[PDB]
Amino acid sequence: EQWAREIGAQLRRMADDLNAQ
Amino acid sequence: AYSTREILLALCIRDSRVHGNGTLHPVLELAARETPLRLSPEDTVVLRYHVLLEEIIERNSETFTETWNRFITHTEHVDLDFNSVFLEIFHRPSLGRALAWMAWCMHACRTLCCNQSTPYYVVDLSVRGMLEASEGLDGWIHQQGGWSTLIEDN
Ligand SMILES: [Cl-]
Ligand SMILES: [Cl-]
Ligand SMILES: [Cl-]
Ligand SMILES: [Cl-]
Ligand SMILES: [Cl-]
Ligand SMILES: [Cl-]
Ligand SMILES: [Mg+2]
Ligand SMILES: [Mg+2]
Ligand SMILES: [Mg+2]
Ligand SMILES: [Mg+2]
Ligand SMILES: [Mg+2]
Ligand SMILES: [N+]
């Protein structure tokens, strides 16, 4: 539901942040 | 040649050894028995990955707390919902997304095992769910030379 989608969005974001390093 | 399931379980075991009283939750003992766990939690690859994930956790401490508490309080089927989150993250992959997911799973296991009031079944199905869902990374990791190569050379 909404909760699972918000979690997936946040973790994809934080991932792109670490890829920028 | 270690699987994602093995390295994530070893990371969760290592994390427990350095948190609280150092005792392992029975669930992690089971997962190590049923999963043919060949990787030592004290292996340098595990110790090296543990720092990366701990750094991710601390940098995003609040978001990890919020996301987990929202997850565990709204789920009616813990282990299946871990798969749903996994598939949403990896729409289809990057090293950052893999580590972000692994850190979130390690953080969840830590929170579950540190709170002595958490019911056994909640800890049980959460660990099972994160380990089974994480199997979806084996194909991609294999193409990157394995977890050891990613940390030792990338
Ligand atoms: Cl490996
Ligand atoms: Cl730590
Ligand atoms: Cl980060
Ligand atoms: Cl933290
Ligand atoms: Cl916090
Ligand atoms: Cl449940
Ligand atoms: Mg240890
Ligand atoms: Mg993807
Ligand atoms: Mg898309
Ligand atoms: Mg909890
Ligand atoms: Mg299992
Ligand atoms: N990558």
Residue numbers in the entry:
A (entry chain B): 131 to 151
B (entry chain A): 2 to 93, 96 to 157
Authors' text:
The structure of the BHRF1–BidBH3 complex was refined to a resolution of 2.78 Å, whereas the BHRF1–Puma BH3 complex was refined to 2.0 Å resolution. The BHRF1–Puma BH3 complex showed a clear and continuous electron density map for BHRF1 residues 2–94 and 96–156, as well as Puma BH3 motif peptide residues 131–151. Similar to the BHRF1–Bid BH3 complex, BHRF1–Puma BH3 adopted a globular monomeric topology. The four conserved hydrophobic residues of the Puma BH3 motif, I137, L141 M144, and L148, protrude into four hydrophobic pockets in the canonical ligand-binding groove, with an additional hydrophobic pocket occupied by a fifth hydrophobic residue W133. Furthermore, a conserved ionic interaction was also found in the BHRF1–Puma BH3 complex between R100BHRF1 and D146Puma. These salt bridges were supplemented by additional hydrogen bonds between the carboxyl group of E89BHRF1 and the NδH side-chain group of R135Puma, and between the G99BHRF1 main-chain amide group and the side-chain carboxyl and amide group of N149Puma. The fifth hydrophobic pocket of BHRF1 is utilized by Puma BH3, where the structurally equivalent residue to Bid I83 is A134 or W133. The binding mode for Bcl-xL–Puma BH3 differs from that of the BHRF1 complex. A similar trend can be observed in BHRF1–Puma BH3 and KsBcl-2–Puma BH3 complexes, where BHRF1 shows nearly threefold reduced affinity for Puma BH3. The F72W BHRF1(1–160) AlphaFold model superimposition with the experimentally determined structure of BHRF1–PumaBH3 resulted in an RMSD value of 0.48 Å, confirming that the AlphaFold-generated structure was nearly identical to the experimental structures over the backbone atoms.
Epstein–Barr virus (EBV), a member of the Gammaherpesviridae, encodes the Bcl-2 homolog BHRF1, a potent inhibitor of Bcl-2-mediated apoptosis. EBV BHRF1 is a Bcl-2 homolog that potently inhibits host intrinsic apoptosis via direct inactivation of cellular proapoptotic Bcl-2 proteins Bak and Bim and selectively interacts with a subset of proapoptotic proteins (Bid, Puma, and Bax) to regulate apoptosis. Despite sharing very weak sequence identity with its cellular counterparts Bcl-2 (21.7%), Bcl-xL (17.9%), Bcl-w (18.4%), Mcl-1 (9.6%), Bfl-1/A1 (17.8%), and Bcl-B (21.5%), BHRF1 adopts the conserved alpha helical Bcl-2 fold comprising eight α-helices, with helices α2–α5 forming the canonical hydrophobic ligand-binding groove which provides the interaction site for the BH3-motif peptide. BHRF1 engages BH3 peptides using the canonical ligand-binding groove of its Bcl-2 fold and maintains a salt bridge between an Arg residue with a conserved Asp residue in the BH3 motif mimicking the canonical ionic interaction seen in host Bcl-2:BH3 motif complexes.
